[PDB]
Each structure stands twice: as C-alpha cells, then as structure tokens.
Amino acid sequence: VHNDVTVPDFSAYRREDVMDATTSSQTSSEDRKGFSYLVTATACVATAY
Amino acid sequence: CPGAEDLEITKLPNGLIIASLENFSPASRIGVFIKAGSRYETTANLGTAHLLRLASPLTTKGASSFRITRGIEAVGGSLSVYSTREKMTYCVECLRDHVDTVMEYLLNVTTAPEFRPWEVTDLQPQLKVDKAVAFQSPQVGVLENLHAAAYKTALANPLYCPDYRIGKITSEQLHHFVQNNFTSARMALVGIGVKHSDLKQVAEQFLNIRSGAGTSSAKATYWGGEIREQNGHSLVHAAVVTEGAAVGSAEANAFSVLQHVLGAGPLIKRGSSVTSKLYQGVAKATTQPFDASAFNVNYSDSGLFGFYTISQAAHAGEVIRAAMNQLKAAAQGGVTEEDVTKAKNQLKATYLMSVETAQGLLNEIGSEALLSGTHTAPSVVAQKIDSVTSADVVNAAKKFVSGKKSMAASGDLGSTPFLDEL
Amino acid sequence: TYAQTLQNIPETNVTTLDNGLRVASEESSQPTCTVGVWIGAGSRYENEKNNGAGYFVEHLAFKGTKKRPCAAFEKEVESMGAHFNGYTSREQTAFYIKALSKDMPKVVELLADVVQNCALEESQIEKERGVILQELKEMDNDMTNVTFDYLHATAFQGTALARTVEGTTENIKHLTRADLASYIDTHFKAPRMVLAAAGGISHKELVDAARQHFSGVSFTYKEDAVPILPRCRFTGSEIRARDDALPVAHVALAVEGPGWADPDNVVLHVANAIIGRYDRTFGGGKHLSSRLAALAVEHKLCHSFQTFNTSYSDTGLFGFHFVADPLSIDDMMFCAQGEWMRLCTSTTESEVKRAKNHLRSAMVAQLDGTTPVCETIGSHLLNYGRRISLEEWDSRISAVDARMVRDVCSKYIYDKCPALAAVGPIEQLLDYNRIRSGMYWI
Amino acid sequence: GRLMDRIRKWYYNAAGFNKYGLMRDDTLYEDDDVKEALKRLPEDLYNERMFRIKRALDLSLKHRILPKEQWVKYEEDKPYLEPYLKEVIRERLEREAWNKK
Amino acid sequence: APNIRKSHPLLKMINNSLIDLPAPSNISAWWNFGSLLAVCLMTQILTGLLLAMHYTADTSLAFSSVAHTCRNVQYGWLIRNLHANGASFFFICIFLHIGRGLYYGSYL
Amino acid sequence: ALLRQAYSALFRRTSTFALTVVLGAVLFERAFDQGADAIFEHLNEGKLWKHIKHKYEAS
Amino acid sequence: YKETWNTGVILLLTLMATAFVGYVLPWGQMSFWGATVITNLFSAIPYIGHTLVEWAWGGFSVDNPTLTRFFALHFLLPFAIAGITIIHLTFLHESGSNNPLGISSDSDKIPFHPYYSFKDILGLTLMLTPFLTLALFSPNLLGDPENFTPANPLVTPPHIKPEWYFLFAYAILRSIPNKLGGVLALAASVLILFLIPFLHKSKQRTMTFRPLSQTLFWLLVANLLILTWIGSQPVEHPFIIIGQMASLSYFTILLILFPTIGTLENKMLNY
Ligand code: HEM
C-alpha cells in the first residue's frame, strides 16, 4: 500500500544549506536561487557583450 | 441587542404558505418548498422532473443564466435544489445583509423560467453525468429498483431520468410541468434568519405563477414485485420491504420506533451496535463483514418498511434470512418493554439533532409548513412519540411479516434468495 | 443586521484545571449538544517505530475501558441515543460525543474514562490489527488521499510530517499492547488536551464534572510542559506514481505555508477563495466567477479541482489538487499555474470583494451545528490557545484588499520551488523544470 | 412620410441578394455573434437557411440567378435571425459590462 | 485551445519541434551535431551574404575583390576567415554526425 | 547577504533581471575592453605604433 | 482573414524591394537615377536619415558597393518571397478560401483537384498569351529608352520617370511639396493596406450586394489610374493640382468614405 512508500534520501545531492531535515529550507532559498540566477544573469551579460 | 423569537407562519388567500423564524444567525437560508417530483410524471414525460432540478441555472424572464450565477456568487451566496419523489426544495443561503439580492434570483428561478430551447438542449447531456456520479453508491440503484418493485405507478417512477429519455425531454414538457405543479397552493416560502414581515412581503408582491392545486398525482398502487440486478459485484446489496405507514399516519411512530428497535444506523465509530436487534442477529449468523439496517420511508399516500442489507456474495443468503428472523422474532412479542424505551430515546435524540444544522432546521419547518401549514412543538412531537405502546411496535412488526413484500437486490446474486424463499 | 448578529453571539468560556487541562464551551439554548476532548497529538508525534499507534489507539478508544468492558460501554452510550465519533490526524486527535444537553455530565465522565482508562484488551488488539490492515487497502484506492499522502511524503521528506496518519504495514503488524499503552500515557495528557462543548450546557456544570473526572493534578513544572516539536523541512520536489491502468489522474502541487498563528493565513484563504474550486456538477458551469473554473468548463480541463491552505503549528501546505483525463493534464496544470501567477500579479478589488464574502459565509458554515462548533473550539484553543470569534475573523477579512493578496501571494508563491505529487496516467504532465517555470511571470 | 420605407425598398432591390433567393439574414458575415445565434435556430429554420445558401452558391458558380418570379420580395423577406442575434449581443454586452468590475 | 503556444498555426510548429518535442532522456553528445550542423548552415549563409556583397565574379576581378574585402572592408578579413573556416567546421560536424549515425544504427 | 539582496532586487522580477543584464553588459564591456587592451599592449610593450609614434611625431 | 492579409502585405513590400534592387542592376541611366531618387527618400527620416543612406550606399553616393550589395539582395529576396508565400498559404488554410457571395461555403465544397487545378492551368495560359505577345512582339513597350544608355553620374535624364507599377505611388510622393511630408504620404499610401481590416463596418463580407460600396470601389480604381497617369507627367499645371486631388481622394475613400458608406448601407438594410 502507498503507506509503505517513502522518498529516498538525497543527501548525496542536497545543497549544504538544506542537508538538515530539522531546519527551515526557506531561510537559504533566496541565496540558493540568488546564486543560480547570478550565473544565468552573468551568462546573459557575456552573451550580450 | 437581539434575543428570542417566534416562529410565525402566515398563509395568503391564494393558498401560499409563509413560515419564517428569526434566530439572529448571521446567515439566512430561504427556500421554496413545493409538492412536485417524479411522482407526478407519467410514462410520456419521465425524467422531466430530474432535468428541471438541473435547470435551476438557466435564464429566466428576470435574470440571465449568466447573472443568476454571477449575481449569487457576487455576495458569497449559494443556490441549490433538493428533491424526493414527491417534493422539490429550492433554497439559497447567504449572509443576512444580502437576502434582498439573493431573493430576486430564487424568485425568478421558481416562477419565471424561460427554458430556452437551446439552453435546454445543451443541458440534457448533463443528466448522464449527474446520474453516473449518483449511481456510484449501490444504495441509489437498489432504492430505484425498490420503488419500481414496490409500486406500479407514481412512486414507482425513478428519481433519476431514465437513459432512453436523456436528450428527449422538451422545453414544453418543462414548462407544462412547472405550470401544472408549481402552483401557489402547492408551494411554501420558508425562511430562517429573516423577519416574517419581510419574507411575507416578498411572497405576495412577487409570486405570480398562480393558484390551483395543479395536476394531482395518481394514487400509489402497491405491487410487491422483485427486481434482481446481476452485475457481479463482490458485495450484494438487498432490501426487503412491505407497505409501511404514510406521512402523518398514526401508525408512523410505531414503525419509527420499531426501526430504532431493530437497528437504524451506527452510533459508535467502528463500534458494534448492541442496541440493534437486527444487526446483532445478522452478526451471529455470518463471520464476514456486513451491514444490516431497518429501512423506513413515509410518503404522502403510502410508505415502505423493511430492512436493507449489504454482505459478501457467498454469505448473502444467510445474512438476509437472519435479518428476516429478527423481524418474525419481533412480531412474536420478542420485544422488551425496555427496548421500546431505549429506541424512543434514540428517536427523540435523532430528531433533535437533525435540526442542529441550518439545512435540517429549514427542512423540518418547511416540510411540515407545506403538508399542513402548521408547526408541531418539539414537545408535542416527543409527546406523540413516547406515547407509543410496546404493543404498537409488535403490531408494526407483524404487519411486515404478513404483508406482501417487494424486494430488490444487486451484485453477484448467485447466493441471494428469492422473495418466495424468505 | 449582519454585524449585530456577530456581536450578539455568546462568548466562548475557558477555564484551566491546574492539572493542565483546559475546558471551553459556547452556550446556546439547544436541548442537544456535543462535547469531546481535542488532544494535541498525532502521527507527527510518532516516530519510525510507533508510526500508526495513535491510529491503532483511535480504534480501541471505543472498544471499552477498565471500569466498563466493551458491551457495557457500547450499550450505555447506544441506549442514551448518544453518538460516539472521533478522528486522528497529523497534529491533532479528537474524541467527541453528540447527545442531549441533559447528559452533558455523564458524557464528560465517559470521555474522561476513554482517554484515561482504555482497556487495550490484548485480544481486541489482534482483532483490530486485521481491521486496520483492511482499511489500508480500502484507502489505497482513494486516489485523492493517496495523493495528499504522497504530497506530504515528498513535501516534508526526511521529516515527521512525511509519515501518514494510518501508519506503516510493518508497524501495524507488530505494534505491541505496550506501545499503544506507551503512546497513550506519553501523549494523552491534561495540558495537551481541551474539553470542548457546545449547545445547551452550563459552563460551570461542565467545568464541575470536569474537575470530578479530570482531577489528577501535576507537581513539577515539566508536567505542565507541552513539548515543542522539531521543525519539518520543506522540500521543493516531486513524486510520480504512474499507472496508466487508472482511469483518471490526480495531481497536487503546493508551496510551504506559514503555520496557524500567522495572520497572513486570512489572506491566503481569501486568495484561495478567488480561485475557488469546481467539479463537473456545478450547475453554474461556464459562468462561474472562478476563472480557472470557467476555463475548466470551457476546455473540459478536469473532472474537479480544489485549492487548499492546510495549516500546522509551524508550517503548512498551500496548493491545489485536480483530477483530469490523461490527455488534459498539461492544459489544466498550465491554467492552474497561470491563475496562481495572476494572484501574485494582477488580483482585482472586485475579485477580493467577492472572495471575502465567499470566505465569510464559509467560516459561518463551519459553525453549523454543535459538533462543527465544538470542533472549532477544540481546534482554536489547541492552535491559537484561545477562541477566535466570527467577529474577529470578519474584522481581519474586512481589512484584506487586492494589494494585500498580491503581496502575500507573491510572498508564498512567486518563484518558489513547489512540491508535486502525481498519481495515475500522468505521462502528459511535463517535467519538474517545466512546472518550476510556471512559478514566475504572468 | 414614407421616405425611409422608399429608400430601404430601393436598396433591398438594388442590393440584389434576393435574385439568388437569399433572405437579408442569409447574407450576414458570420462573426462570433452571428455564429452563436445560428446555433440557436430551430432545426427547420436552419435546414431551410442551408438550402437557400447552397442553392445560391450553385447559382453563383453557374453565373445564373433565379427567374424573376422567384426573387424574394422586399416585404416577404423574413428576418429569421435578427431576434436571436439581438439577444446574443444583448447577453454579450451584459457579460462585458459585468466583467468590468 | 487555452494556450497560444499550441493553437497558433506558427508557434504550434515551434512548440512541436523545439519546446514540447519528446526527446529520449539518454541521448549523448553524439546527438549534438544535428543542431551544430544547423547553426553552421545559418552561420555560413550569413557570412556568405556579407562576403557576396563585396565579391565580383569575373576572372579579372575575383581574386582582387576578395583581397579588397580582406584589406578594405571593415572586418572583411574576419568575415572571410569565419566563412572559410566555417566550411571546415561544417565538414567536421557532418562527419561526426554520420559516424554517430552508423554506430547507433540511426540509419534504420 | 549579497546573493539574497541581489535575488530580491535584481533577479526576482523578470523586468529588473532584464535591466540588470543591460547595465551589467554596459559595465562589463567598458571594463573588459580596457583590461583586455591593457593585457595585450603589456605583452607587446615597445612593438606597437603607440609605443614607437613619439619618435616620428612632429606635427 | 487578417493573417493571410497581413502576410500578403509583407509579400507586396518584399516584391517591391526586389523589383527595385533588380531594376538597378543593368546600370543604365534610369537604373542609376531611380536608385538615386529612391535611396535618397530615406534621407528624409530625421536625425538618422543621412546616416542610413550613406550606410546603405556603402559610400557617399550610389556606386559600386551599392551595385554589388544590390545584386546579392536581389538574389536573396525572391527566396524570402517564396518562404513567406508558404506562411501566407498556411494561414489561409486555417479557413480555406472566401468566395464571391461572402457566405459560408461549407455546404458546397469541392476538391481542389481537378476543379481548380484545371481552372488554374487555364487561367495560366490565358494570361500567358499577353505576356508572351508583349515580350515577343513589343519587348520595349514598357521600358524607358533612357535605360539603353550607360549610367552617367554627371547627367540626370530630363524626365526621370519610374516603371509603370510605381507611378501611382510616385504621384502621391510628389503631391506634398515638402520632402519629409511627401515621403510619409508615400509610405502611408502602401501601409494604408494594414489598416483596411479595421475600416470594415459592413455587416456583409463582400461588396457583391452593396451597390454604394461598388461605386466607391471603382472610383478608387479610377483614382489609381489617374494617379498612375499623373505620375508619368511633369510637375506642372494642371497636373500638380489634379495630382493633389487624386492623392487626397485616395486617402479619403479608404479612411472615411468606405467605413462611412458601410455603416450607411447597414442602416438601409435595417441593421
Ligand atoms: C553550406 C554553406 C556554405 C559553404 C560550405 C560555403 C563554403 C565556401 C568555401 C569553401 C569558400 C571558399 C573560401 C576561401 O576563400 O578559401 C566559399 C567562398 C565564398 N562563399 Fe560560401 N559557403 C557557404 C554559403 C555561402 C552563401 C549562402 C553565400 C552567399 C549568399 C556564400 C558566398 C561566398 C562568397 C562570396 C565566397 C567568395 C569569397 C571568399 O572566397 O572568401 N557562401 N564559400
């Protein structure tokens, strides 16, 4: 039954700031996105140039 | 700063009954009760009442389909229509300060429908859908067949439009139905969270589809037939009944009490029903999951009484027979004087709880305010109920064992017995 | 008028029996009433070993106590026309009775006896063990619930909220009479319980019987200590359970919610009111005010859809769920996400005006009878540690405007990583990345 | 006096769709409003409209018109769709007005 | 249709070939040369036009018109290099595209 | 909290993200060209006409 | 059928550019000076005008780099025309063809083959006769003898006159004695086509049953003839005034009379 289903462990992949299950993941969200989007925004600058 | 209030109840010269009640609730729930239903249909217009139920959102002379829906939603209101084989209720709920708004719509829908040909054509395929979801409960299917086996006419008519007629109902049929049934003398404008003078005013100054008793329904003739639907389901639902008591029939309370004495539904979650003669009996007979209950219906000119079961296919035989013995055993004085005392409590309780919700209170008021333009005090009703001897009950029980029975069952009926083996 | 009716509603009385318990009730003039105890317990309080205990308990809480074995317990309740129901969830449990106000006291005794002296019949346990296993197979066919379980299973993966209320197959097959016992003693405790009642009952008469049956007082400060649960981490992710043999598909998408105490919840509930809900039997059809509902009808996008703002102590799930044919999932998700974007970006005053009215009548509806009102009381003290009148709610609702809906919605929704659960014939539902993009601009 | 009537009758005749057996309404460009109205027409009125149109297209491809005796007469032209079309537009404007807050 | 990306007769085409197009989840770098070949084509055409605008097809002027392009046209030399080498890049990519095809039996 | 500040002010709204890329490019170009030209001329000190010019300049 | 129409206008514009750059290639006197007049039209654009023209020229006047780039353009554009034709027919098939009565033809459709394949091949040979007759018996009826004289940068022909298909527009360009004003009138004379779909007030699609519009229609056609004729004459009385009249009425018929009359006709139908 579905009750016996659980999401595997993604610690071998999680970013450092969301590795701990008892910590809000929202507090590190803006940084996690700010960084990824920074890469993208920079690639856009290099491309425009 | 509000307090208590009276349950007024005028009754205009044209026969329209008006019952109101201020409970100072922040929410008002008005409704238009009417004596209409599949009961009044004939072979020719079968299902017309079902479609009419779904046609509530169609355009009227006063409001368009669009404004009816947008208008009512504009003020967090709602509009719905409930119906039985013999009565149709159109009620609207909304916050007090919007009763005026919502009212225009309730009015238009019940008295000024336009049943535009195209809107109607578009709506009919809905009958298929509405009916498909309803029939997901086996309960609904067997009750349909039940009334079809119990009667030869009127009440025998199904509550959901038969398939061969989906798409064939006409605007003329809807109009003629409304004209010959939605008459001032068969209607009642009931309301809660309102002031009689206000509700009373709306009725008279707005309700125009006029007087008369309209076309009267044919009398309900008992058949005592037997319909079996072999559909292969692991569970077998079966119902066995006998002509019971009619609405208001003195013999009503007797069956009500016998109902609660035999077993009228669970009271404890996942708990067994000990106070249930019928359940306890079936339980002793079968080891597998099942369900048994006392069935009971009261209509204007008739009623049905018996038991409804649900059991695995292989044990249907024993489960149904077990339920039968519990009825005989009861017809043969096998009813304690304390049993009748307990049942009378569950009955008084049930009734009293039924009116906790706005939907239940309004339905109680209007139901009675329709079939007798009056209102029995919750004490007189209790006074009438407990004043039911142990004899009465045993008699009701006898009337069942001796009366001609009709039966309906569906599922893998390979082990389900025929009415003449009970 | 409306206002006046809100002010004239009888106030909710509260008192605390220094042993830790709280007794609250709302008085009316009804010969009938409902009373029960709302416990701050649930699957979230369980762990890997005792998951499904509180549920296993919920099954025995009605099969008899020490003072009175099964048959005796049932007969007594049945014979008085009272109704005994209850439920167990993730952060909240409840056992309540519907009966004649005339029996409020005997009931309170019965409640106390249930929560304190459950027989936990060794033989009944093995019997319910098989019943529960059957209920898990019954519920496994309830897509909507399989879907919300999965939504929690991934939204809160690795934590406590990830577990289901019913528990595991292994737990149910091996939970011990001692475990259930331990569960009860550990959680069913005065400071974490609320005796709620509504109908025609004397608050004092209620509190009196309360003192009489809920007596055991505490000495230390830790016995008056309600344990704060550890945080449950939210995770933008998805779980895809595919079975093309299923007729329809269920999809649920959600972002992390604030949690009970947060005022923003009034705004989220207004927002959800704008989007509303729908199913193929809403006569309103193509004229429904909910844009998503309109589109659903027009394009036949789904069989039904619903928004939700599920709260908890410190978190919540704000999202929506829909059922659609395998070939219309993509368009539905497209419009659903599209509407969320409109919320954060282009909400109208008209939109909220309507949503507000809709919300008011919705709150008023959750107080329709003694049981629903009682449930409000239990839940309110247990979550807000106090009852919140309809007048307060209306006060808060009235303050909400388009701008507010946008900021709040932009706050919890815009450019967030959602949690996704899809069950059934879901091949048409595009990948996470595509869905993730539906979280911004529009 | 009867100026407008005179003018309309002249135009009708000058227009000439009646030479193909078409009613004024048969000639309307099928925009959204018209398409909706057409769907509300009773079966017979609809089938009749269709024949008149197919017949006219046949005349158009043949480069012929109908014999003068079969031309529709100004006063016998039946405005079969106008009533429907007006309701349709009336409804549309209501939705439009209403959706503007 | 609810969203333009699918109803519009032109976008519909872009959507069905570069947006919603179903692609195998495991194709490797060897499946990159199709798009690269497309870009060479667009690149070659664009640089070719630019060169053609200063070229002169006549035996007495061909050689020098190319010289004129590389020596006098703003970035003429650059555009010529990009065109001449682009042709090589085109063949490198077509050969690898072919290799991938033979190896993975794409020719089926 | 630069990544955080940058996200809210620049990267969140698609509009602001676009303005950030425009100015970013403007700034980048000016700096990249200058630095690039410097690095190139430095690796070729004394070989460019820029370096030699003064000897024959005599306007 | 707005998309079919709009792409239709793009096709016209592209064909115009094509014919222009193509006409310049033989490099006769008319090729050169026409290339001079046309390119200098762009210099009328304020601020960027001079800059764009010199850019397009690749120098300070129409010269060799103009010629070589024009050849390349002339070679390329025809293919853009072919491609956009596919888009044209693609939008068209979304609805299929309209027809002379302007009423739905769903009740009476027929396969393109062999009905229109045969009809089309017939139309082909009918138009092919004049074409070949002209080309084979009167090769130079339409060209300017001036183009049989090698371009001379220093001598401008006395009467610079464009190819017949550009005369009406040229006429309009000259109506406005102000450089920029005349250029705008010229641009508008063609771009006015993008506006047509929005000036439709008739409740009927075609003009078949609209006698007043039909008159207005032929007036417009004749107005075009007048402009064509005017564009071939020298700027002098009475041409100048006749020209401005025709120009003014051209725009008046399209922007005012057509929608106005369309509305007027609706009322005469009692709509
Ligand atoms: C499939 C794309 C193309 C390929 C493979 C290609 C290849 C080449 C090659 C091999 C050369 C010789 C380069 C050299 O000088 O050493 C060449 C020359 C040239 N190509 Fe292309 N070309 C392509 C497309 C085009 C297009 C579309 C045009 C013009 C519209 C064009 C115009 C020219 C011109 C003018 C030259 C002569 C100038 C020069 O030699 O640099 N080419 N091309």
Ligand code: HEM
């Ligand atoms: C290179 C130019 C063009 C080509 C090759 C072309 C080709 C076609 C073809 C083959 C058709 C279908 C048959 C027909 O009805 O004639 C068509 C129809 C049409 N074209 Fe063009 N066209 C061209 C230019 C234009 C222009 C300049 C306009 C408008 C400014 C235009 C507007 C249309 C429209 C609206 C139709 C619809 C016909 C109907 O009423 O059914 N076309 N075109």
Ligand SMILES: C[C@@]1(c2ccc(Oc3ccccc3)cc2)OC(=O)N(Nc2ccccc2)C1=O
């Ligand atoms: C064939 C012709 C032409 C073709 C299409 C035209 O349409 C335009 C094309 C591009 C830009 C503006 C108009 C204009 C001229 O090209 C050309 O040189 N001429 N000759 C000419 C003579 C005097 C003044 C202006 C032009 C054309 O007629």
